[PDB]
Design a protein around this ligand. Structure first.
Ligand SMILES: [Zn+2]
Lengths: 454, 121, 126, 49, 102, 171, 134
RNA sequence: UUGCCGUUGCUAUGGC
């Protein structure tokens, strides 16, 4: 048995490498490095923070105050929020408008404050990739990001620019182009409690910036498709996911190194695993992330998977195969064009062309026990991760959001044992990158806010 | 036998869609039904992908007869939305074609997908 | 795929080279050796002195073709079926057959020289 | 040394059109015709044995 | 615009000092511009501009980053005590020449 | 590298003619270098075939060899057998160099345009500008071959000929 | 007779048996990721050198760790550099093809003799091998 | 509660 001989010889090999618990167990170099550890400074940014907010089953779920404030902007795309240590929120749309909200009036719907709308006036007079230093967006703003301190919001989209606006007036303070032709930005994330931005640009590139210095730190390379989502916490690590290469990478940005995590679910072995006694299959494209803590994260796929990954395992720890359902099959009055229902039913091939909803938004509350998933099934899902950190489980649903969920994130309130949050979710009737979405089933372009309690 | 007969399963579908995305980046993909039939009657096509769930189905079933005439592999992907997303355009496509090129950096991948869908067909 | 003839087999056994292993460490590639029925007829006609050579040509690793002509002239058969198709290496040690094969173009020629096989008109050997 | 092998390979693959018949890429536009002649007496096919 | 990153900041009370490694970031600039770097370091930390010092500069290939070794003092007098004389000649105020004979 | 056995036979001369013309090579030393180390590679894989199944050398060095050959990119992901290392050859190795790859990705119009782009530093894989043409890109650096951002074919400031013509036409 | 303090027998060797085929199989079946670089950052002299091998980037990581750890640049020490840098780069351009070293496949060194086939757990009894299984 | 437009509430919904 050749793989048995491989495992056996590898075991003998590791035993021989060990060859080349007592009462005294102290090692001189380890305790010397621990003396240097006692000598050093800056136990602030580099907390390898584990899950210290265990509250998944604690708070209420089923009776949230859900207000779906519809807004008149075609296809809202992103949502950025802010809390100091009054709270503002930000939305941005495919109609080239950024909009500031106040959200701190917690028991009611948010309040519009200020527009900032680019348009055809901001097309540059050059068509030349480094004099892209205009003051507004002329194409398809895809992402906003508020500063952790709140001086600025920074936004960008398919016009390959980063425009950083002031908070108090929504004015463009600085323009930083991405200096090449395909340099469309797709996701932005500040590292927490900082002034450092991580943008993920479709050149298979990740750009980093210091916003209050108007400088770019480091460009870091290495995905294989467009870097569709990004996520960061207080550590200088980052977690990006490229779309169709089906890998999620995490980046030690000062070292400029990474850990890659591929997928790897196969319907052959999965249907055999069920065949030991079923509509589930392989993977299209890993789409969204959120780093839950500094040892784990969660990925949202294109076949409706939500997966939970550790920092110490290439293959994922936990899967959840169907997370928002399978799409309604196309009707017999809109598949075939024959006359009889028998042939128009034969043109469905049974179950072979039922496609699942793909999770287009995922948000893990940082270091907490609970994350929120959203797609165009109409109902957001709330999941909590078990305390042994090897599984998660569906708590409840938030069914007042008709449309695609282009963004989810939460806003905190309450103290250490009694808490209430408003879950913002940007709702559109069209995916945040291309159109591709038919059967617009009662959708509206709005902000689904929910107020969850206890 | 349905009309959209030689459908691919999920592993072959993702192999097809990955090489479709790479050919679309390398300008070797002609996307859409009448561009596909144009490149098919011109003879610069290595295999055609039709999506088996558009709102009519004969709208692209016109193409298997052309592929049969000129001996070109044809395969049915079960999602027009995923096919357009792989093609890299902001709309669903119902048919696409991989044009022939010998200064092409993905020729081995295209030939492997051609062999897989031809043993299917 | 390499067409063998009778003096190549005789020189292989006289120099103690295995057929498929000598071919493999000559070309550094996977070889399929082919005994045509006329080469086999010639080895059988060589008599009971060449029993060792005949039952080393009888080897399941050595595949075998089916020539369709009258007579057992292996040099004519090898020359015809190689200048028809140009997908063949010719392993031979006849001086006349070596001159015929290296006069027709695009045909690599293998031969027992020294204590291993050599190859000449194959331009990718290393 | 590089331009010499660029221009003796262009010469070689222009001579290759003389000895063989090279697959140029198929039918370009409308089939105009053979453009050079059709010989009804010559058969350029390899006979067996 | 140059950019600054301190890493692995330890304190040496025996030498009355605070030392660290300096990732200096200059996209589309030439290099570190060490006096301007001492200015930027002396303003990100506290004042002591004749008590902040950097010595070990290595720029990686293609530019952009350079790793240096940063040590910052309190008390410019004890910085003059503890720093070596060649770095004091390079940056600060000391200048004593060697007697040129044989 | 090392010279071949019979270096002047006409098949070898037409071979090197086709290789240097189809891949834009400067002399015979490119072919001879890459073929010398390919000879070492498949001379090793021949011995790995001449030993038997469940040999430790065969198991570990065989999957090691085919995995680092797949990661160089001359061998595809599905053929994970050791006879494909014998079926490997020299243009499978020099299709992986950066001049060939720049032309195949279409940043250049020929292999000679690719060679002069590389030697004039308009091409960067990943982060670093590569400037030698025979680079042997890998399967992960295959998709980050793009124009350098320090170059006018990327998005940078235009070169001396363009700016001097602009200045003289402004005069 | 008597004891005599032997640092060569309580010193961490771990290199007589470190074989790259076994280490590659362990990296394959490791089930924890591997700290690879952002893809352009590991080529060396604009491609005039190789990419860099895995042992070379391990050694580079060790040198930069020691470098930052005690604040000292390493040097151009002539005898050691004329040995190691020139011989190392010449065998690098000999055997390292595209970031992968193929030098081992051209090298006689028995795998199972030194690095496999355990010597301490040799199990030279039927009873000892029976207890080692069960 | 918005680009219009409808039911509107004296606040929620649904069609482009
Ligand atoms: Zn015969």
């Amino acid at each position: 048995n050749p793989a048995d001989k491989r495992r056996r010889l590898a075991k003998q090999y590791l035993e021989n490498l060990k060859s080349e618990d007592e009462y005294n167990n102290f090692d001189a170099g380890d305790l010397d490095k621990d003396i240097i550890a006692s000598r050093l400074k800056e136990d602030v940014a580099e907390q390898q923070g584990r899950v210290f907010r265990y509250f998944g089953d604690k708070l209420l779920i089923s009776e949230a105050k859900q207000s779906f404030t519809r807004v008149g902007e075609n296809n809202l795309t992103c949502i950025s929020c802010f809390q100091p240590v009054r709270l503002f929120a930000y939305t941005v749309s495919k109609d080239l408008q950024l909009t500031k909200y106040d959200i701190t009036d917690f028991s009611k719907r948010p309040k519009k404050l200020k527009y900032a709308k680019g348009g055809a006036k901001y097309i540059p007079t050059s068509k030349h990739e480094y004099e892209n230093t205009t003051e507004g967006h002329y194409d398809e703003i895809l992402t906003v990001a508020a500063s952790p301190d709140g001086k600025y919001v920074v936004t960008g989209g398919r016009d390959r620019k980063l425009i950083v606006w002031s908070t108090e007036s929504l004015s463009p303070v600085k323009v930083i182009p991405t200096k090449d032709r395909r340099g469309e930005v797709l996701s932005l994330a500040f590292r927490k409690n900082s002034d450092q931005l991580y943008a993920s640009c479709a050149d298979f590139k990740i750009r980093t910036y210091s916003i209050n210095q108007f400088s770019q730190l480091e460009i870091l390379y290495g995905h294989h498709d467009i870097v569709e989502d990004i996520s960061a916490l207080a550590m200088e690590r980052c977690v990006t996911v490229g779309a169709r290469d089906r890998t999620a990478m995490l980046w030690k940005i000062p070292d400029e190194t990474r850990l890659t995590f591929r997928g790897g679910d196969e319907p052959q072995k999965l249907l055999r695993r069920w065949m030991k006694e079923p509509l589930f299959f392989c993977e299209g494209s890993i789409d969204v992330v959120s780093m839950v803590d500094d040892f784990h994260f969660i990925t949202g796929s294109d076949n409706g998977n939500i997966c939970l990954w550790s920092l110490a395992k290439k293959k994922p720890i936990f899967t959840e195969r169907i997370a928002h359902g399978i799409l309604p099959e196309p009707s017999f009055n809109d598949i075939s064009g024959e006359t009889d229902e028998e042939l128009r039913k034969r043109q469905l091939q049974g179950k072979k062309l039922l496609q699942p909803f793909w999770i287009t938004s995922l948000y893990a509350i940082p270091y907490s026990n609970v994350f929120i998933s959203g797609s165009w099934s109409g109902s957001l899902k709330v999941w909590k991760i078990s305390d042994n950190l090897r599984s998660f489980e569906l708590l409840g649903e938030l069914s007042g959001a008709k449309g695609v969920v282009t963004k989810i994130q939460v806003v905190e309130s309450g103290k250490h044992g009694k808490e209430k949050f408003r879950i913002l979710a940007s709702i559109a009737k069209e995916h945040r990158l291309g159109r591709w979405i038919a059967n617009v089933s009662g959708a509206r372009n709005g902000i689904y806010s929910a107020v969850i309690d206890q | 036998n349905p009309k959209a007969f030689p459908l691919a399963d999920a592993a072959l579908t993702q192999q097809i869609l990955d090489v479709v995305q790479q050919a679309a980046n390398l300008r070797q993909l002609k996307k859409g039904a009448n561009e596909a039939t144009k490149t098919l009657n011109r003879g610069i096509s290595e295999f055609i992908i039709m999506a088996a769930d558009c709102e009519p189905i004969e709208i692209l079933l016109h193409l298997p007869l052309l592929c049969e005439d000129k001996n070109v592999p044809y395969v049915f992907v079960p999602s027009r939305v995923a096919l357009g997303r792989a093609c890299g355009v902001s709309r669903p496509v119902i048919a696409a074609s991989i044009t022939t090129n010998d200064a092409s950096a993905i020729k081995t991948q295209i030939y492997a997908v051609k062999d897989k869908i031809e043993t299917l067909l | 795929q390499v067409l063998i003839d009778t003096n190549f087999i005789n020189f292989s056994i006289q120099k103690k080279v295995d057929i498929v292993r000598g071919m493999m460490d000559c070309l550094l590639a996977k070889c399929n050796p082919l005994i045509t029925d006329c080469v086999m007829a010639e080895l059988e006609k060589l008599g009971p002195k060449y029993r060792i050579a005949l039952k080393l040509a009888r080897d399941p690793r050595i595949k075998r073709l089916s020539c369709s002509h009258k007579g057992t002239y292996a040099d004519d058969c090898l020359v015809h079926r190689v200048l028809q198709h140009k997908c063949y290496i010719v392993a031979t040690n006849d001086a006349g057959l070596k001159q015929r094969i290296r006069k027709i173009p695009g045909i690599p020629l293998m031969s027992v020289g020294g204590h291993a096989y050599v190859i000449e008109k194959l331009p990718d050997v290393f | 040394s590089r331009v010499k092998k660029r221009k003796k390979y262009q010469k070689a693959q222009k001579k290759l059109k003389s000895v063989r018949a090279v697959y140029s890429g198929g039918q370009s536009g409308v089939y105009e015709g053979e453009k050079t002649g059709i010989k009804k007496g010559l058969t350029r096919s390899v006979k067996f044995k | 615009a140059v950019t600054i990153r301190t890493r692995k900041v330890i304190s040496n009370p025996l030498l009355a000092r605070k030392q660290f490694v300096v990732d200096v970031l200059h996209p589309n600039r030439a290099n570190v511009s060490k006096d301007e770097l001492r200015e930027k370091l002396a303003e990100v930390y506290k004042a002591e501009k004749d008590a902040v010092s950097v010595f070990g500069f290595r720029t990686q290939f293609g530019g952009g980053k350079s790793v240096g070794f940063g040590l910052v003092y309190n008390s410019v007098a004890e910085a003059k005590k503890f720093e070596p004389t060649y770095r004091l000649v390079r940056y600060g105020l000391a200048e004593k020449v060697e007697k040129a004979s044989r | 590298y090392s010279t071949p056995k019979r270096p002047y036979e006409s098949s070898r001369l037409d071979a090197e003619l086709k290789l240097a013309g189809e891949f834009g090579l400067k002399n015979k030393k490119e072919i001879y270098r890459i073929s010398f180390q390919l000879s070492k590679i498949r001379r090793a894989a021949r011995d790995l075939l001449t030993r038997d199944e469940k040999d430790p050398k065969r198991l570990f060095e065989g999957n090691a060899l085919i995995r680092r050959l797949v990661r160089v990119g001359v061998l595809s992901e599905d053929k994970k057998k050791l006879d494909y290392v014998l079926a490997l050859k020299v243009e499978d190795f020099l299709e992986r160099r950066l001049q060939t790859q720049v032309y195949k990705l279409g940043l250049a119009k020929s292999v000679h345009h690719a060679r002069v782009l590389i030697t004039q530093r308009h091409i960067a894989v990943g982060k670093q500008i590569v400037n030698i043409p025979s680079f042997m890109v890998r399967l992960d650096s295959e998709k980050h071959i793009d124009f350098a951002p320090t170059s006018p074919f990327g998005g940078a400031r235009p070169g001396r000929v363009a700016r001097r013509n602009a200045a003289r036409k402004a005069e | 007779f008597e004891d005599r303090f032997d640092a060569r027998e309580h010193k961490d060797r771990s290199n007589k048996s470190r074989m790259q085929a076994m280490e590659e199989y362990i990296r394959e079946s490791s089930d924890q990721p591997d700290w690879s670089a952002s893809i352009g950052a590991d080529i060396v002299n604009h491609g005039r050198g190789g990419i860099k091998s895995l042992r070379d980037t391990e050694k580079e990581r060790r040198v930069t760790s020691f470098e930052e750890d005690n604040f000292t640049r390493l040097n151009i020490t002539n005898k050691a550099e004329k040995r190691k840098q020139k011989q190392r780069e010449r065998n690098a351009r000999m055997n390292v093809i595209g970031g992968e070293d193929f030098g081992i496949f051209s090298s006689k060194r028995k795998l199972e003799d030194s690095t496999s086939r355990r010597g301490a757990k040799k199990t030279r009894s039927a009873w000892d091998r029976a207890q080692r299984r069960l």
